[PDB]
Amino acid sequence: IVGGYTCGANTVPYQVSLNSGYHFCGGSLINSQWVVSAAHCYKSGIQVRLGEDNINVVEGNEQFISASKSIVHPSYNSNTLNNDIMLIKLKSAASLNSRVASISLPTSCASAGTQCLISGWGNTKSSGTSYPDVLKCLKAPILSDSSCKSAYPGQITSNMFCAGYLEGGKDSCQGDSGGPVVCSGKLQGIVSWGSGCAQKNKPGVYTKVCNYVSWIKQTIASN
């Protein structure tokens, strides 16, 4: 996250870290056994780390659980990034309380101008690299689809939205992928891609979660 602030420990209780001997992507807990992330984050051997604040120190709210199932959307396209969503089933259920909790799925899509909270342990620089120990947050609005398409001609599908700023300085970045975009208490976006990070006229692009609620529910029910 570039241009954000320190969230505070366990203030974003649904945020998870995906680890393969190192943090590589984020995710969002949607029930005690299932996590939503981005399809471009798929790999074998994922360990999900719940209850984290400082990802480099064992502080006392961590639950480390191996993924038992890592399910990419069947129509994920790795060149256009369309349908960038993955569901991860935990090998055992997480224990839920105030510091580890699920986030609700949308009941309808969100609107342009609504403020959302984006979070993760990704790069905090728009030039160069610096990875944080503690979770970072950013408040950012949903942009109109016409602004998003003007920013990225020919690349915005109906399963994507832009959120953030056009003036530069505030955005998600490498290492934030898969993590949450929460608006009005609902998981509306998944951190997916962008041209660089926090660059003028190039806002972040996110997977539009409201289009996949029925697919999420069916995939969980059959697995």
Binding site: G175, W193, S195, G196
Partner: peptide
């Protein structure tokens, strides 16, 4: 110049 935000990033010619 598009890149996904994973570590490491997946990036394209634009």
């Amino acid at each position: 110049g598009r890149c996904t935000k994973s570590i490491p990033p997946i990036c394209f010619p634009d």
